[PDB]
Design a protein around this ligand. Structure first.
Ligand SMILES: [Mg+2]
Lengths: 197, 304, 70, 149
DNA sequence: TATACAACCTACTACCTC
RNA sequence: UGAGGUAGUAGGUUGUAUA
């Protein structure tokens, strides 16, 4: 590769040269192509496999466009506001927030029952609360950075709470459908039966 | 597993290369499975077995099969792996490293920084300031001894994240003109890119960038040259994050792939994970079975 | 089946014959089976509110690919 | 629709300063990077293990093929690929008698039996290392079938 | 200190070979 | 342990919030 094209000796610079400078394999493949073109004579699978190996020494990828599916199913909309209700003395201390119709958490110092909606009746029918003390936060600032963080709840916790609500809501929803349950190590699996479909 | 690690540990004490071969591997037709069928039949892959065994034997006798060429000159790649030592004293966590760098003749130096630095907590897969200082100082001194100069950059990668105490200790040790970059390589986050039309999976080398500091890399899948797949059942990508550092997300991915192309223990196209971490895990598995070696050898022949 | 081993030894047996297509179509069909609306699935997070998940997963595309073998 | 970037596959060097991506093909065409002159082997195991090892070592001196020679490149042979002499004739042997394995393997605790087998094998290896004149570059441990279980 | 979660970590057995 | 990969199972730790 240190021999300039302006320095090649006469009677060679006008011929058709094969480039072994970059890689010897490409040069050898070009040599074999030239030999096979101009009917060069040649004579137990040690050479057929060898020839295939030389040919496939570089099966480079092509500039072809492809489209790939994923398993990340997106969420197109959220409820407008995330609510925080008092329900003090109307919710027993020895009563878990699970086994309840709607996804609710009892997180933070007070203002428990983190659910998106009201109507936990027939399960704790105190039905006597003052809605003025309830705290309401916009889900837009919770998910999308913003100034949703305060001394009440910082932004990081405010999102790990929403992920918990979604993971619970999926579990409660996937029970009015027509599937049964399987218990894995750390999660639940949903499968369809034989009679259905 | 008790036999192999103990044998390697004592021969490590005596520094003797060794290789364990089962009788079923070398002669698989003799050991049938009570039904006239070999338990492990190598009929269709009899040449791959020979490739692997010959390459391993050649490497263990002091010979280089190949070397890496496209790697940034002036950087050090360190891989930290934690193994749980819980036998008598406490559920301690030992840290074993592996170092790779290339300069002064285009040669490749692939060793392992050893002398496991412990941490006496049940969890806490991190290093206290003194142990981190010792680790970085030893790696830097080894590089300076080999290259007669200090590294321009250091590329620390691990399967766990780094905390501010460890990074402050590292920056305290590091010289005036040396930069440090931390990378965390998780392996099993749930992303699976299916191909819409064909019955063959996504190609190897495709990378998806989710942010200026995080990206996915497909180190497995369908490779054009071999016309086959490096895995099965819709290969899984790996997750790369630039934790505690300042660098570009493309150079990191290129370096990760280059590191994946260094598996001497087997003769394959490439492996999913970088080899600097796999060899560190092997070193840890070998060491934790022994009893308090003072200064273990750093060469890879004795371990693998 | 009330055993944790014969299910592993059957999962590993059955998964060997399934490739890109047989996983993709099955996952998409299972997701579409649950959906109530033609384009979303309803999660009742309350008596008046709900969370919708799109029926069609995220799609990626690239400019470099390979010629599929026969 | 998100865009996926592509990273070109790295290249590993071989003999003569040449480049490739598949180590098997690169070794087959060009060869290794350095010159060790031969591998003087040493076997530890029963006599049947020695016979198995010698048979395999003689087998790998000549070409071996697979079913798909594109998915898995063939093996030319040891000396053709590496340029090294690794032969069955120059083998140093240290024998583990059947009585020793029968005595040590049976009974005892799961830890004790493993410690006993490791002690036996490594005592043989170390004693051969320090109390012998013949050089052994790499030692091969041909583990019998019963020791594994 | 112990029990309800989301986010991260390691360590084993059992089954495949394209 | 000639190797590589896929999946299952078991536990643990930190940051909240409670009893
Ligand atoms: Mg090995």
């Amino acid at each position: 590769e240190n021999l300039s094209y302006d320095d090649i000796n006469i009677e060679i610079v006008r011929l058709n040269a094969i480039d072994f400078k970059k890689s010897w394999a490409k040069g050898l493949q070009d040599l074999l192509d030239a030999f096979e073109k101009q009917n060069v004579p040649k004579k137990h699978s040690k050479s057929n496999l060898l020839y295939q190996q030389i040919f496939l020494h570089d099966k480079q990828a092509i500039e072809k466009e492809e489209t790939y599916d994923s398993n990340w199913f997106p969420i197109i909309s959220f409820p407008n506001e995330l609510r925080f209700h008092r329900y003090d003395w109307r919710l027993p201390k020895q009563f878990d927030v699970r086994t309840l119709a709607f996804p609710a958490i009892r997180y933070k110092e007070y203002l428990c029952t983190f659910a998106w909606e009201y109507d936990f009746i027939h399960q704790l029918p105190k039905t006597e609360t003052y809605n003025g003390q309830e705290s309401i936060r916009i889900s837009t600032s919770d998910i999308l950075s913003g100034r949703y963080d305060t001394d009440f709840i910082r932004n990081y916790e405010c999102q790990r709470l929403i992920v918990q609500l979604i993971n619970k809501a999926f579990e409660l929803r996937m029970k009015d459908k027509n599937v049964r349950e399987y218990q894995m190590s750390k999660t639940f699996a949903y499968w369809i039966e034989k009679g259905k479909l | 597993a008790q036999f192999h690690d103990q044998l390697k540990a004592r021969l490590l004490e005596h520094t003797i290369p060794t290789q364990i071969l089962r009788e079923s591997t070398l002669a698989w037709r003799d050991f049938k499975n009570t039904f006239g069928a070999p338990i492990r039949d190598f009929s269709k892959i009899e040449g791959h077995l020979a490739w692997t065994i010959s390459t391993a034997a050649y490497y263990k006798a002091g010979g280089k099969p190949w070397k890496l060429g496209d790697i940034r000159p002036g950087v050090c790649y360190l891989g930290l792996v934690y193994k749980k030592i819980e036998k008598s004293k406490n559920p301690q966590n030992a840290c074993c490293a592996a170092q790779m760098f290339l300069d002064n003749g285009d040669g490749t130096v692939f060793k392992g920084e050893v002398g496991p630095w412990y941490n006496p907590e049940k969890g806490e897969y991190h290093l206290k300031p003194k142990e981190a200082k010792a680790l970085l100082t030893q790696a830097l001194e080894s590089y300076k001894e080999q290259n007669k100069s200090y590294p321009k950059e250091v590329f620390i990668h691990a399967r766990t994240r780094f905390n501010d105490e460890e990074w402050n200790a590292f920056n305290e040790v590091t010289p005036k003109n040396t930069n440090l970059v931390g990378v965390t390589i998780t392996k099993s986050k749930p992303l699976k890119l299916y191909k819409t039309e064909g019955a063959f999976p996504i190609m190897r080398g495709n990378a998806y960038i989710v942010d200026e500091k995080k990206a996915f890399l497909w180190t497995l899948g369908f490779v054009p040259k071999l016309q086959s797949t490096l895995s099965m059942e819709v290969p899984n990508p790996i997750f790369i994050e630039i934790n505690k550092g300042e660098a570009e997300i493309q150079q990191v991915l290129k370096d990760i792939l280059a590191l994946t192309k260094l598996n001497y223990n087997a003769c394959i196209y490439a492996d999913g994970e970088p080899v600097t971490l796999r060899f560190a895990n092997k070193i840890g598995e070998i060491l934790t079975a022994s009893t308090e070696i003072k200064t273990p050898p750093l060469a890879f022949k004795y371990y693998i | 089946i009330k055993s944790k081993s014969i299910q592993h030894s059957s999962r590993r047996k059955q998964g060997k014959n399934w490739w890109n297509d047989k996983w993709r179509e099955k996952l998409l069909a299972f997701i579409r089976f649950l959906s109530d609306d033609q384009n979303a699935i309803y999660l009742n997070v309350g008596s008046e509110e709900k969370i919708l998940i799109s029926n069609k997963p995220l799609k990626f595309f690239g400019k470099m690919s390979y010629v599929t073998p026969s | 629709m998100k865009e996926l970037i592509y990273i070109e596959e790295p290249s590993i060097l071989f003999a003569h300063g040449q480049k490739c991506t598949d180590p098997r093909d690169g070794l087959a065409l060009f060869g290794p990077l350095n010159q060790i002159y031969g591998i003087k082997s040493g076997v530890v195991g029963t006599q049947k293990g020695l016979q198995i090892f010698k048979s395999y070592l003689d087998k790998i001196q000549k070409p071996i093929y697979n079913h798909n020679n594109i998915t898995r490149p063939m093996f030319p042979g040891f000396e053709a690929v590496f340029g090294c002499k690794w032969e069955s004739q120059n083998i140093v042997f240290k024998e583990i008698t059947d009585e020793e394995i029968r005595r040590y393997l049976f009974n005892a605790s799961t830890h004790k039996r493993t410690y006993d087998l490791v002690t036996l094998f490594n005592d043989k290896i170390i004693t051969a290392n320090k109390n012998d004149e013949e050089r052994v570059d790499v030692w091969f441990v041909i583990v019998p079938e019963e020791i594994y279980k």
